Assembly symmetry: C3
């Protein structure tokens, strides 16, 4: 009669690395690295992205004729654009503090156009001024959200105002025209030596037109320079100009949800839903890390420069035909026949044989490994982030500093993730090793000299041991007083 | 007989390990600090500048509402209310205001001095003021600042100052932006005017920007202030054809390092600290804290955690090696002098005796673990809160992203350090018990039965002297080898 | 006749720290902190740095007389300056967006000065003007790459010239405006009052008016020159127009970029060596993960930490004469006499002797430790970075943000490198202890009761055991039943 201590083996060819060993085959393993995306551009927490396609934010807000059929949701979580949007300032020029503007309208509630300065009420000015650079049909056209040239032969001082009674912060854009030459100034605005002034309770600005010689861009040597401000509720904005004013017709009511970013991609909305979007597609995961794309938006796993992070959950797989020396050691191989536990017994007596999982050590192992995997996964913080940022080409240093920070964390997470995995795997294999070793000793210390140690994790009894006796061994209530029979040993 | 055993007590302290939750241990050490003293304190002997509900601009310009301030000549940080009420009484703006605020967060020395006495502007009217700065309640004006046409003429306003004071000097000046050309003529006579300021490093010019504007503090006009740091022995030249708001004073300033502004309602209560937060100060040696992110001083790492409890004692049982809660089922309330030890049973009596050797070794070990964790942590001076204008949102976001990045790294790594090391500490105790058990077993060999519960049953009479040789590892096997099992 | 289990000891004096223990002597050790450098300034990935010495980038590009013959390379990978360069704006002034300019030319391929606006084609203006502030020896001179346009006789007619970039590459172009000390100087130089300077390209549009005002003399001058720059695209035109106060370029700079680098501040000069990582003290050439040489590096560098020592144990605890209780435990000391392995056997016989190492155990241990060491090294991700940055006097907050980030990483890497070392040294010592305990048990299970277990690592045989039998024990094929007849007495 005999009982033998042993451990589970199977047909897994799954491999993991440890600190001490490479490519160890384990019975089971879990990948903590998310590599797959659904390939879709989705909504984020129910709220869709604003889809700009070929238009830039400036193009959209000024109303570049080529952005007319923009869908323009009432509410958005992020903004989707193509890499180098072709439709922006159709009439050539610049846009002050453009990047701050973008960052501001990145996530909105609540977004409503308002006709703050009706085209029709500039009664003493011509209002149909257009350009072939903004051509439609084609005829000379212009930014649709914007409007002034002399009426006949007179450019009276233009004085209009607007009180923000919309019940919300209003974004307002305006421009100044920089003519090509003096004759052009006088033919457009009659007056020379002009200005454009804009005032609110916090904004103070007066611009003078700059008449100079420049190359043609979209066929035009002239330039238009735009600025913007946030008009507070119940506050007034006053425009005054003797010429060169590019007036807005509309302002924009803004309620900031939070702060998001702009995603560059050629994909379009679908729904689908996600908590984490990438330019490649969305990510749905529990895992602490991913390697899909650095530029994400939402609550995402830590991005790492890794192609594989696999945790061992089972033990070393040793099918047959360690710090503790049990597994692949003094018990030379695992049992494929023992399918209902991690560690257990094989027995032979008169009544037969012989596999039985040990429920106690098995359940300790299940509870332990589950805890370990859960620790590694659950302790990871996950706050909302919009990685990609916008910088002008005179902000290269600021851009480089942002890049240096993202690279820094990447290096920290990657190295930390890789080593954590190598170190825990080593521990996990030793944990199994030790459980086996302790099971063997549990049996050895019960039986004492009522049995012989045969090697290979086996015990031969110096007495008959029936199924009831075997149970007592397996559940730790073996009765040693019975040391006779046993002198059968001598 | 002689038995091997380990310590137990009435502790109910819980720790988590990588493999286990809520494990009761005999002793634990919390390494997360979560108490402050509730007070606003001095930082390394040097007090903060308390501005109450005045802003830094309001204080330096001399907003009348800031007269009874009480500044010190030296401070290690600045305390402000979340939203100061007293800044620019006369509406306007302050160029590079944030750069200025950053410069004076921490000073030594700091002294206001008169550099351009106002009575020496003999060709200009200097008494001008505003109901925006109303006192009592007549027109008044920023008390450190001063120019309007005299009769009907505004001659060039040209004066200079040489910084012979011995320290770098802060000097602030402004330009006034009137309501319309008519008011410009009324105040300054001329229309196309300018304000030029020059030192040997700074060249700045401002022109009036007239626009129609809503009344703020009753006024449509605005003032735009600028500033420079005048080096020792350098000159500053003011030259203006109109619109200059001139300084009468300057500020001598010696800077040691940089600090920050703290937003709080509290007032200095007279205590010392090395680490201040808006809720109170922190006096601690622990490597982590969760009191508040915006600290000033030499502070523990701020983590998102509620609890970081390191196990020091062993599992409390009133492991990898199979002894604790293993073949030795439980602890011994009775053994008080050590973690590990023996219970003996003789004709002479019983029974407890601590093993001071393996206990001391263990204690030294755990002592090294604790202060390896605690002492490897760096703690250089830092001021977390920073200032950004509302056109630096991207920059402010970059800063938050950075603080959030380190918060995440530290929080994760601290939680995981505690779990990992707690499992090793419990295993370390387990190993010490096992090793002690084996020391005895390998000493007794044949002369004793291994019972399997921690106990050894002698095949001979072992009196007290003999027991002592077992404990001190000199048991004489050959002497008692008479066996007769 | 006896056989003993033991471990290697030597003359090593090397010390390591572990999480539980300070100053433990080990037989072998390996430092993973790079502390040495070659003490030279080197080519970075084949490409030399630009050496400016005591000249500033501005001094060099404008052609300050003390800077002009600088003798540059056509391609560079970084820039080297003295801490505080003596030569810059000899005529006092300022440079707009200077830090961004310096960041732009930090790393190039290709670079080439070209004469874009021949000094002599300014026919209607005087062109030879200079300053005592730029005195050569000791005649008034001027920035050699620029042209100080002044009146011809009593006339300054409108100055107008343009240049089309047909060079093949983007072109850096610089210009300036003179802000005189007083009206008399304005009239002497330019005749006209109320002048302006105008410059325009496809994207750039600027008009500046001179600022006449009294200022402290610097290098004898009260006036100032404010310089600006732009990048002119291929096939674009730049237009200059001035009625006075223009400081025109004569030259432009063809520039191609292939990434960004940095400026390095050192007294050192270029030697003939190659590196992937440069320091102001010398070049680093290591695979190690950490270094403590200097914070301001350029290249693909190890992570900088505050420590002076990171020593990993590789050999075992040196006990000249643990979790597992053998090393410095029940086997009290090591053997200076076992030189052919980490663990092994002694054996005392009728035939004498002796020592012999267990090759298999030793070999498995060497493999483990090697993987360990390589894991810590190989998992570290390295990226190209230039640590030192340029910020102006009004960018203190930005500078402080950069410092806070570097300090943040420094604390993270230093704390984790040191804790890693301590943790792994604990596990390494215990690894060895375990290998020893496992070897001893392997012997114990073969010999069984044919021998006495002393308790100090030795086994006393109950039977004569010659060299062949001593080998079977070492071998794992002892044959217990062969000597079973003959033990104790029977
Ligand atoms: C007036 C005319 O017919 N001029 C002929 C030249 O063409 C004109 O050249 C000017 C440059 O001085 C402009 O480019 C003109 O283009 C427009 C445009 O933008 O399309 C014409 C628009 O109608 C006009 N819109 C408004 C509101 O004024 C616009 C603006 O004036 C400018 O943008 C102001 O900066 O200009 C263009 O038609 C022609 O090249 C030349 C060849 O022989 O003959 C000229 O008679
Ligand atoms: C006292 C009062 O309320 N008077 C009423 C007139 O108000 C005047 O309106 C002008 C604008 O047209 C200014 O706001 C005047 O305010 C002051 C101020 O700031 O307090 C008066 C100061 O004395 C003056 N200081 C100087 C040096 O000139 C200051 C400056 O002019 C401006 O700040 C420049 O921007 O203005 C205010 O008294 C009002 O015009 C009339 C009804 O319209 O009723 C009067 O009772
Ligand atoms: C710029 C200037 O005039 N500064 C002067 C300095 O030249 C001189 O050394 C000192 C002597 O009083 O006074 C001050
Ligand atoms: C060599 C040549 O003529 N090509 C370009 C020309 O096409 C371009 O328009 C420019 C701007 O004027 C020069
Ligand atoms: C002395 C002894 O142990 N004998 C054996 C030898 O017969 C065998 O050849 C070798 C393995 O090849 O191992 C050993």
């Amino acid at each position: 009669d005999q009982i033998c201590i042993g451990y589970h083996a199977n047909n897994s060819t799954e491999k993991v690395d440890t600190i001490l060993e490479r490519n160890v085959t384990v019975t089971h393993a879990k990948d903590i690295l998310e590599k797959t995306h659904n390939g879709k551009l989705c909504r984020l927490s129910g709220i869709p992205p604003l889809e700009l396609g070929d238009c830039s934010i400036a193009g959209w807000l000024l109303g570049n004729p080529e952005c007319d059929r923009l869908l323009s949701v009432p509410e958005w979580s992020y903004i989707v654009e193509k890499e180098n949007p072709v439709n922006g300032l159709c009439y050539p020029g610049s846009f002050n503090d453009y990047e701050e503007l973008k960052h501001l309208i990145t996530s909105v509630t609540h977004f409503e156009k308002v006709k703050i300065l009706p085209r029709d009420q500039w009664t003493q000015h011509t209002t149909t001024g257009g350009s072939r650079a903004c051509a439609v049909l084609d005829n000379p056209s212009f930014f649709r959200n914007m409007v002034l040239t002399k009426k006949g032969s007179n450019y009276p001082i233009a004085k209009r105002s607007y009180n923000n009674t919309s019940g919300e912060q209003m974004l307002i854009i305006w421009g100044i025209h920089h003519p090509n030459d003096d004759a052009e100034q006088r033919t457009l605005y009659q007056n020379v030596g002009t200005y454009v002034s804009v005032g609110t309770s916090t904004l103070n600005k007066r611009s003078i037109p700059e008449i100079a010689t420049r190359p043609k861009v979209n066929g035009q040597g002239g330039r238009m320079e735009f600025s913007w401000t946030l008009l507070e509720t119940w506050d007034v904005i006053n425009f005054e100009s003797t010429g060169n004013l590019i007036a807005p017709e509309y302002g924009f009511k803004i309620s900031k949800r939070g702060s998001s970013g702009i995603m560059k991609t050629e994909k379009t909305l679908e729904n689908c839903e996600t908590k984490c979007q990438t330019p490649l597609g969305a990510i749905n995961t529990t895992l602490p890390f991913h390697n899909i794309h650095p530029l994400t938006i939402g609550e995402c796993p830590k991005y790492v420069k890794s192609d594989r992070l696999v945790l061992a959950t089972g033990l070393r797989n040793v099918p047959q035909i360690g710090l503790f020396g049990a597994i692949a050691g003094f018990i030379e191989g695992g049992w494929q026949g023992m399918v209902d536990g991690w560690y257990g017994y094989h027995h032979s007596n008169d009544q037969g044989s012989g596999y039985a999982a040990d429920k106690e050590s098995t359940q300790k192992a299940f509870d332990g490994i589950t805890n370990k995997v859960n620790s590694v996964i659950e302790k990871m913080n996950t706050q909302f982030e919009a990685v990609g940022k916008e910088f002008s080409n005179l902000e290269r240093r600021l851009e480089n500093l942002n890049k240096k920070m993202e690279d820094g964390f990447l290096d920290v997470w990657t190295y930390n993730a890789e080593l954590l995995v190598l170190m825990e795997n080593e521990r996990t294999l030793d944990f199994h090793d030790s459980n086996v070793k302790n099971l063997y000793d549990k049996v050895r210390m019960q039986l004492r000299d009522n049995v012989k140690e045969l090697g290979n994790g086996c015990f031969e009894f110096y007495h008959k041991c029936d199924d009831e006796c075997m149970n007592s061994v397996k559940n730790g209530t073996y009765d040693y007083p019975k040391y006779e029979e046993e002198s059968k040993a001598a």
